Amino acid sequence: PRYLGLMSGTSLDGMDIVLIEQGDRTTLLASHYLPMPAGLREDILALCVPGPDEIARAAEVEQRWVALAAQGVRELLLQQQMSPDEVRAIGSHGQTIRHEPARHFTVQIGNPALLAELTGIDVVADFRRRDVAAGGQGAPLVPAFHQALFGDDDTSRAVLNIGGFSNVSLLSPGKPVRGFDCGPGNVLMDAWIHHQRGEHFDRDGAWAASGQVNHALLASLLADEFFAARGPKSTGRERFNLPWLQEHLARHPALPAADIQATLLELSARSISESLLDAQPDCEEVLVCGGGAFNTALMKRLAMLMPEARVASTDEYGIPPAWMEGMAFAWLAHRFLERLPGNCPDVTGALGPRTLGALYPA
Amino acid sequence: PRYLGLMSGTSLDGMDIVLIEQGDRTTLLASHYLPMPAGLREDILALCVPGPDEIARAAEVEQRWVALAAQGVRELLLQQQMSPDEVRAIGSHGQTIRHEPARHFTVQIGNPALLAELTGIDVVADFRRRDVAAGGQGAPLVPAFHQALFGSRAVLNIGGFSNVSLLSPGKPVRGFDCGPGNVLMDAWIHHQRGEHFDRDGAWAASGQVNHALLASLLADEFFAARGPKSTGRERFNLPWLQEHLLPAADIQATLLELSARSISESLLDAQPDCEEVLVCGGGAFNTALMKRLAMLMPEARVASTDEYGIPPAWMEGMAFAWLAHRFLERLPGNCPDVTGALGPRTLGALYPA
Ligand SMILES: CC(=O)N[C@H]1[C@@H]2OC[C@@H](O2)[C@@H](O)[C@@H]1O[C@H](C)C(=O)O
Numbered sequence: 001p002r003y004l005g006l007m008s009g010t011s012l013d014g015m016d017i018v019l020i021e022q023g024d025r026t027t028l029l030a031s032h033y034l035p036m037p038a039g040l041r042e043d044i045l046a047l048c049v050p051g052p053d054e055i056a057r058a059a060e061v062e063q064r065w066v067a068l069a070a071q072g073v074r075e076l077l078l079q080q081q082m083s084p085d086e087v088r089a090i091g092s093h094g095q096t097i098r099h100e101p102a103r104h105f106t107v108q109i110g111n112p113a114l115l116a117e118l119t120g121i122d123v124v125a126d127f128r129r130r131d132v133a134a135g136g137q138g139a140p141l142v143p144a145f146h147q148a149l150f151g152d153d154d155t156s157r158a159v160l161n162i163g164g165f166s167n168v169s170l171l172s173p174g175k176p177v178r179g180f181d182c183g184p185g186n187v188l189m190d191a192w193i194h195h196q197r198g199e200h201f202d203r204d205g206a207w208a209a210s211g212q213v214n215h216a217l218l219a220s221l222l223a224d225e226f227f228a229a230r231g232p233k234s235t236g237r238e239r240f241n242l243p244w245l246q247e248h249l250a251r252h253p254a255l256p257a258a259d260i261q262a263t264l265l266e267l268s269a270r271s272i273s274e275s276l277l278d279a280q281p282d283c284e285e286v287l288v289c290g291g292g293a294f295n296t297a298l299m300k301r302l303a304m305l306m307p308e309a310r311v312a313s314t315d316e317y318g319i320p321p322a323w324m325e326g327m328a329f330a331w332l333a334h335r336f337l338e339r340l341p342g343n344c345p346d347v348t349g350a351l352g353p354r355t356l357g358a359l360y361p362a
Numbered sequence: 363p364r365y366l367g368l369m370s371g372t373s374l375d376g377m378d379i380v381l382i383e384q385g386d387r388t389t390l391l392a393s394h395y396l397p398m399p400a401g402l403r404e405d406i407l408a409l410c411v412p413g414p415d416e417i418a419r420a421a422e423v424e425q426r427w428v429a430l431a432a433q434g435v436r437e438l439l440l441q442q443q444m445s446p447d448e449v450r451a452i453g454s455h456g457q458t459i460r461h462e463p464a465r466h467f468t469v470q471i472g473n474p475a476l477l478a479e480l481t482g483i484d485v486v487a488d489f490r491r492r493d494v495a496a497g498g499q500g501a502p503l504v505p506a507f508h509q510a511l512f513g514s515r516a517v518l519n520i521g522g523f524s525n526v527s528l529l530s531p532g533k534p535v536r537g538f539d540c541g542p543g544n545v546l547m548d549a550w551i552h553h554q555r556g557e558h559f560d561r562d563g564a565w566a567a568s569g570q571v572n573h574a575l576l577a578s579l580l581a582d583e584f585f586a587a588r589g590p591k592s593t594g595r596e597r598f599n600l601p602w603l604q605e606h607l608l609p610a611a612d613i614q615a616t617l618l619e620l621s622a623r624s625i626s627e628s629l630l631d632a633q634p635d636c637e638e639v640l641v642c643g644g645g646a647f648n649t650a651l652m653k654r655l656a657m658l659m660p661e662a663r664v665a666s667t668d669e670y671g672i673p674p675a676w677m678e679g680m681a682f683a684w685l686a687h688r689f690l691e692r693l694p695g696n697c698p699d700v701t702g703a704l705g706p707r708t709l710g711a712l713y714p715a
């Protein structure tokens with residue numbers, strides 16, 4: 001059947017919407033991006049830290065988020081010349097405003113009942129909670145999907161997402177799927193260039209490529225306890241943010257802004273490489289998705305730090321890097337409806353396999 | 363099949379758990395009450411007003427609430443000698459910590475995914491949101507169930523808050539919240555005398571109704587409104603009463619009359635031809651209130667629901683088990699003429715075990 005996937009990630013630039021065909025395999029039929037207004041982005045970010053009157057504030061933010069998603073679903077279907085009735089379900093991640101696996105909770109907002117009401121399509125949502133409920137991290141959730149797409153018993157491969165945050169799926173033949181967050185992907189580089197130069201992202205990693213890696217700063221950033229931990233682990237804005245970076249910066253004389261940028265690129269390269277190679281030293285292929293796949297300087301640094309492996313963007317495997325996550329969530333809606341597991345216990349640390357999500361019928 | 367119903371209401375004394383048999387009709391098979399600890403009750407109440415760090419605080423409260431519910435489900439099933447596999451689903455209301463239909467939102471907590479994980483049973487939950495999403499009040503939700511059981515008569519719940527279902531032959535089901543049931547009388551006696559409720563309405567029966575206070579309390583805009591309407595702790599609370607504010611027992615007597623009058627006047631305004639009023643909730647055993655309801659509605663027979671085969675205390679739990687059955691059968695759970703929603707809607711969300 002046909003499934004919609006709805007993802008809104010860490011960057012908060014806008015919503016990813018995806019149409020997939022799901023039978024024996026997964027086929028991307030269509031994709032649609034809708035920018036998020038500055039107001040909504042800032043209001044979401046304000047909910048990402050503890051604050052006053054959060055229940056009402058989140059309820060009102062969630063309305064606008066859902067109205068925008070429904071709008072985006074309408075636009076995709078019209079542009080593809082198909083009616084809501086031709087889609088079996090929308091797999092909606094919602095929007096993470098808090099991720100505290102160590103306190104046994106994770107918060108994705110996005111009122112799925114309103115989403116079903118506005119789209120007239122069945123909604124499967126809230127995928128992370130049942131994994132956390134089973135003792136797991138609730139993240140990353142793509143591994144099972146990466147496994148469905150790229151699982152091959154000839155070669156050991158890692159499927160790496162570089163978004164705001166980085167995460168990897170380790171597909172070792174004959175062994176259970178493993179994986180975890182590696183740490184910051186684009187989140188720090190975006191925040192640094194936005195703070196200094198007013199731009200949302202560092203195009204092709206060019207500002208970073210114009211500076212010099214500072215070894216002292218790099219070592220102290222890699223000293224964060226998160227990078228040392230192994231096995232199931234997940235992270236978010238709670239750990240890696242701009243105040244976090246500036247605390248490491250305030251201990252030492254003012255450094256050139258482009259050099260801080262260069263260092264942050266290397267932090268992402270090194271934290272990915274070291275955590276990946278620690279878990280799958282026999283890695284032969286690294287398949288890269290998310291925005292980071294088109295960061296030239298990062299894709300080059302990843303190639304230098306993992307010489308034993310072929311580092312390549314996921315587009316030369318038939319899957320556009322930007323749409324992988326949306327597709328995963330459409331696929332999770334299919335998995336829910338078929339009563340098939342969505343998590344990987346050796347990824348999240350959950351007690352066992354679980355059916356993820358909840359069903360809100362149209 | 364068999365369904366569990368899980369309700370935790372306004373009073374926050376504890377959780378109602380219900381087992382029903384559902385085929386052509388609804389049969390109560392078993393019921394189980396589990397008290398809520400003082401800590402959890404107070405922590406829930408703290409979330410019923412705006413405050414700091416609510417996301418994390420609610421996540422942690424919800425975890426204790428679910429753990430207690432799972433514990434109560436385990437206890438019921440053991441005591442009834444049946445395994446989790448014999449139950450098709452749990453209908454869980456969760457716990458209302460905010461109800462703002464005018465701002466198009468209502469907040470019931472109670473992590474249904476954790477509930478399915480701990481019980482090993484499928485969970486249907488979050489019943490109010492789809493109705494609010496369709497333009498409705500999201501409350502009251504019992505009317506459709508009251509209609510399935512008792513379908514001219516009014517079916518009246520007196521809990522912390524009062525609500526009525528008006529079952530007029532040949533006409534669509536109507537209904538609304540009438541206002542405070544026991545909530546204010548409980549709050550007043552707990553504030554003055556330290557007791558959780560006014561046993562049989564005896565403290566109230568010992569005082570004199572104050573006409574002046576009564577009139578000013580009935581002057582609240584909510585009592586004047588008609589058609590679909592819902593309320594909660596946001597409107598009727600102890601600071602609300604004290605703003606309008608005499609001997610303490612006289613205030614109690616007045617509060618009993620407020621409940622009697624607001625129920626009577628709103629009921630009779632909507633269904634003047636009412637012949638039978640079937641009363642559920644704790645208020646059904648408040649003697650002085652059940653007498654005052656009989657005085658104010660002479661045209662109607664006012665009777666507790668137990669003499670219709672349904673114990674007053676378990677009606678709500680049964681409604682929510684029934685709503686789980688309705689979800690799974692893809693049948694509507696709201697009444698558009700009750701809630702004001704745009705049309706009939708399948709209520710709730712399914713969290714498979
Ligand atoms: C709590 C949360 O939303 N985590 C995100 C984040 O974004 C990337 C990474 O960190 C991953 O763990 C997850 O998202 C992707 C879609 C996932 O679950 O696979």
Ligand SMILES: CC(=O)N[C@H]1[C@@H]2OC[C@@H](O2)[C@@H](O)[C@@H]1O[C@H](C)C(=O)O
Pocket residue numbers: 371372458461468500501502503504505519521522523524525539592593594678
């Ligand atoms: C928002 C909310 O939880 N309302 C409750 C409350 O308690 C009684 C009454 O006011 C009713 O409107 C509702 O619960 C019952 C179970 C209902 O929806 O029918």
